[PDB]
Design a protein around this ligand. Sequence first.
Ligand SMILES: [Ca+2]
Length: 47
Amino acid sequence: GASEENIHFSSCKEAWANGYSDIHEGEPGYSAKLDRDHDGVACELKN
Ligand SMILES: [Ca+2]
C-alpha cells in the first residue's frame, strides 16, 4: 500500500523520473508544496 509518508520532491522533474504523474488527492505531491499553481493536480501529463 503506497500511503503518503512525509514525501518531499525538489521538483516534478524528479517525480516523473519515478513515474509519478496525474497525482490525485491523498497521493504524495498533491499539495501546494509540489504544484506551484496549486490547481488540485500534481506533475500532470494529460497531453
Ligand atoms: Ca498544476
